[PDB]
Every structure is written in structure tokens, then in C-alpha cells.
């Protein structure tokens, strides 16, 4: 059940345009064989240039859009697209290129897929619409073959130089010529009615079609990850570390007992009522109040209308007190709430653009997150930076400079000379706050907060 199988059937339907004639009695071995490639009845490690649904899912990191439109087959220029916005033209003799041979072409397509994916993936996975020139195109930027490693590293071959006989993983490609042993699926074998746009603008009003092959590959991935991560969702499928994945989750933990714990001394509510993770634990584990849990998962489609989250007739009244949504991503958050939301808009290795002005977060697990909404906080502010500890000054056991700060809300503070054990917490805690800030997560709270309210809790 791992790898597909070459003997597995391919609906050749989609490809009757562009190759008028072609077998409706078609297998993967027989279409790679017409693409011009040769599998020598190998074991060795690349079974099917195409892979399974679930391959695909596991190595979403690895997911480009690829797309060939006619200009005009060897007679006429090809225009190539990929989801990366890059359109490139190829001569048989938005970024839009004029037209050039393939042998430079598929220097650029080496040199774009390494700079995409050396930080996100092992490997590149081709999603297709395909309608024929995308296949045939393959044979004049792609060479397969066995499993090889880098000449500079441990890391798998994805690439090939004709020039030094080499093989380069994305981190070491530069100057290859070759696409070495990549992946591809065609998005059409999996049984849509009508053609791309369709598909595509029945979810997604932020990918627009202006007729040209970068659009086309963009939609393609787009429709491919509304269907394996929106419609369909799987939180038992692991992903490897790639950044800061465990530093900004340690962060997130740590902000979040900061703003929660600092929110029930200021303003004192006899009741917390904590809506999303259905595996939560408190966060102030020691703190007074009635901790109160509502089960909900993230949110991957639509934010979930607060009307349904609450009405439909608990505590019921959550109006009492405080509402801590902790990435339980609503249409509009209550005043009395405090708030972690994800930006899907931020650039980073974790985070994938996804469908309809939503992002893929891929952080041990995959969470297709909507669009970053700014009126869902009318009701809130922004939270301030701060550090609270009412643990005691004493050092224990990180060279010094006397720290000097409005916002680090101690005993010695207070007593206008910060102790060197409060000084270390504090900037720790600054680090992973910003840590988790430029990762993309953003904080809100009721609008009556105020840092001024915890020098009191030392008298
Ligand atoms: C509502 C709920 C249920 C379960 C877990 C969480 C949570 O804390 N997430 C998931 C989504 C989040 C994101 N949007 O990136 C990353 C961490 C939230
Ligand atoms: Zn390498
Ligand atoms: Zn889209
Ligand atoms: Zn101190």
C-alpha cells in the first residue's frame, strides 16, 4: 500500500486535446514510458515518477504547481508555469520571461525549485491539472534514475549537472542543469466534474485567472490543498522539524501562562471560560477562578460565527468574566476575551500559502488557517508587551548588564533596582515573545487591561 504502483490505471480523458488519439487504456508505466523516461525495472528507491494521494500529503512541503500552455509541440514556443508566480517561455529552436532555449530554461528551473524548497523539503512533487504539454515537456528538464545523495552532503540528490557528471541536494544545485528524480500527481485523476477554473472558484475568490500558466499552476495547488487540508483533515499525520518549530511552541506556552495568569490578577474574574483545544490543560494551573472548557478543533475552512459557538442556548453566560480563544480563530471575538489569532499573511518556512486568503501552518502538524481578518478584534485591543513574575529575587546556580525596563513588573522593579534572576526571566521571556510574534501569532485582550494593576499584587 506505500508507494503507486506503475500498473495502476491513469484516465487519459484530460490529455485528449492536447494529444488527440491517446489509449483510454492507459497505466502509469506505459505514460511515463510515452513522456520519454525509461524505469529499467529498477529497485532502487524511485519506484513511479507519480505518487499516492497520501504520499503527496506527507511531502506537502514539497508541493509546486506546474502548468504548459501552447504559445502557438516541437513546431510552437511553450509557456511554463509554477505556483511560485513564474512564467517562463521555452523555444524548440505574474513574472513574465521572453523566449529561450531549453537548455537555459532548465538552468532557471533548477535554480528557482532550489531557492523555493531547500529550506521547506527533500524533494519537489509537481501537482498537475495535466492536458498533455506539461507531461511531454518533463524529458527536456528532468532526468531520473536511483536514489543518489548529494556530492556536498548527506541529503538526497534532487538535482544534475551534464556539466560535472554531479548530483546536488537544493542546498548545493547551484549551476546544475537537471531536475533529478522528482515527484508529480495529477490533480484530474481524482475525479472532478468541468475544467480547472471551476473547480478552483468554487472555494477561492483570491487566485483569479488571467489566462497564463503561472495562474493555472496556482489554482492547481491551491484546489489540491482545499481538498486534502480544508475539506479533508488528518491531525495523526506527523511532519519532520525544519525550523523553530520547538523553540515557538515552548514560546506560545510560555506567553500564554504570562497574559492569562497576569489577566486574572488585574482583573480578578471568578470565571474563565477556555474555548477551542478539546485536549487542553489550564494554563495558571494555581490561579482562583472557575475554569470553565468548550470543545471546538481549529478552524480550517471558515472562522467559526461566535452566534453558534455560544447561542444555541456552560456556564452560559459568557459574559462572566474572561473568554480565552487560545487559536480558536472566530468571525468576531466578545469584549471579555483574551486572544492568540495566527497571521496567515507572515512569511515563513512553516507557513505555506493556502486557499480562499487562508495559510497551511505545518508545525508538527498540518492546520490550514482562514484569512487573518482585522474586524474580528473591534471589540479588543492589541495586548502590550510585558513580563510579570512574583517569584523571589534569588539568583541561584548568563553574564550581566543592569536591566532598565518600564515593563518588567517585579518585587525589585517596583523597589526601582531589577535583581539579576529577574533580569535573566525577563530577557528570556522577551525572546520567546518575539520568537512566537515573528512567527506569526498575535495577541488581543478586553479593552480595560492594564499593566498598572499588577504592582499591587506585591504590597
Ligand atoms: C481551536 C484549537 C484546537 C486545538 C489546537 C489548537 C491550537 O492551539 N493550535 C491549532 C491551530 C493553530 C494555528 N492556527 O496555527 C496552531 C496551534 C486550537
Ligand atoms: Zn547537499
Ligand atoms: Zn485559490
Ligand atoms: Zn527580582
Redesign the pocket.
Known amino acids: 500500500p506505500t508507494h503507486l504502483s506503475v500498473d495502476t490505471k491513469f484516465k487519459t480523458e484530460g490529455l485528449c486535446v492536447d494529444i488527440p488519439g491517446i489509449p483510454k487504456d492507459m497505466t502509469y508505466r506505459r505514460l511515463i514510458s510515452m513522456m520519454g523516461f525509461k524505469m529499467n525495472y529498477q529497485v532502487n528507491g524511485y519506484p513511479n515518477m507519480f505518487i499516492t494521494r497520501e504520499e503527496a500529503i506527507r511531502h506537502v512541503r514539497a508541493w509546486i504547481g506546474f502548468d504548459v500552455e501552447g504559445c502557438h509541440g516541437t513546431n510552437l514556443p511553450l509557456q511554463l508555469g509554477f505556483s511560485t508566480g513564474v512564467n517562463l517561455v521555452a523555444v524548440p529552436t505574474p513574472l513574465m520571461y521572453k523566449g529561450l532555449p531549453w537548455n537555459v530554461v532548465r538552468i532557471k528551473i533548477v535554480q528557482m525549485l532550489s531557492d523555493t524548497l531547500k529550506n521547506l523539503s527533500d524533494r519537489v512533487v509537481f501537482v498537475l491539472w495535466a492536458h498533455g504539454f506539461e507531461l511531454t515537456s518533463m524529458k527536456y528538464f528532468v532526468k531520473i534514475g536511483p536514489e543518489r545523495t548529494c556530492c556536498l552532503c548527506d541529503r538526497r540528490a534532487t538535482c544534475f549537472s551534464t556539466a560535472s557528471d554531479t548530483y546536488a541536494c537544493w542546498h548545493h544545485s547551484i549551476g546544475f542543469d537537471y531536475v533529478y528524480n522528482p515527484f508529480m500527481i495529477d490533480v484530474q485523476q481524482w475525479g472532478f466534474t468541468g475544467n480547472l477554473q471551476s473547480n478552483?472558484?468554487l472555494?477561492?475568490?483570491?487566485?483569479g485567472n488571467a489566462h497564463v500558466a503561472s495562474c493555472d499552476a496556482?489554482?492547481t495547488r491551491?484546489?489540491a490543498?482545499?481538498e486534502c487540508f480544508v475539506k479533508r483533515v488528518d491531525w495523526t499525520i506527523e511532519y519532520p522539524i525544519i525550523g523553530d518549530e520547538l523553540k515557538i511552541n515552548a514560546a506560545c506556552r510560555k506567553v500564554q501562562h504570562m497574559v492569562v495568569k497576569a489577566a486574572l490578577l488585574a482583573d480578578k474574574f471568578p470565571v474563565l471560560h477556555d474555548i477551542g483545544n478539546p485536549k487542553a490543560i489550564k494554563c495558571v494551573p494555581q490561579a482562583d477562578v472557575e475554569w470553565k472548557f468548550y470543545d471546538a478543533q481549529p478552524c480550517s475552512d471558515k472562522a467559526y460565527k461566535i452566534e453558534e459557538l455560544f447561542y444555541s442556548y456552560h456556564s452560559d453566560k459568557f459574559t462572566d468574566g474572561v473568554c480565552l480563544f487560545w487559536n480558536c480563530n472566530v468571525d468576531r471575538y466578545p469584549a471579555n476575551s483574551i486572544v492568540c489569532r495566527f497571521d496567515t499573511r507572515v512569511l515563513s518556512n512553516l507557513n505555506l500559502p493556502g486557499?480562499?486568503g487562508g495559510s497551511l501552518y505545518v508545525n508538527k502538524h498540518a492546520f490550514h488557517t482562514p484569512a487573518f481578518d482585522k474586524s474580528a478584534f473591534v471589540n479588543l485591543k492589541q495586548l502590550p508587551f510585558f513580563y510579570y513574575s512574583d517569584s523571589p529575587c534569588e539568583s541561584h546556580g548568563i553574564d550581566y548588564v543592569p536591566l532598565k525596563s518600564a515593563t518588567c513588573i517585579t518585587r525589585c522593579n517596583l523597589g526601582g533596582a531589577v535583581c539579576r534572576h529577574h533580569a535573566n526571566e525577563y530577557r528570556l521571556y522577551l525572546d520567546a515573545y518575539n520568537m512566537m510574534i515573528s512567527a506569526g501569532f498575535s495577541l488581543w485582550v478586553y479593552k480595560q487591561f492594564d499593566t498598572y494593576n499588577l504592582w499591587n499584587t506585591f504590597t
Open positions: 478552483h472558484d472555494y477561492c475568490q483570491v487566485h496556482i489554482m491551491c484546489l490543498v482545499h486557499c480562499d
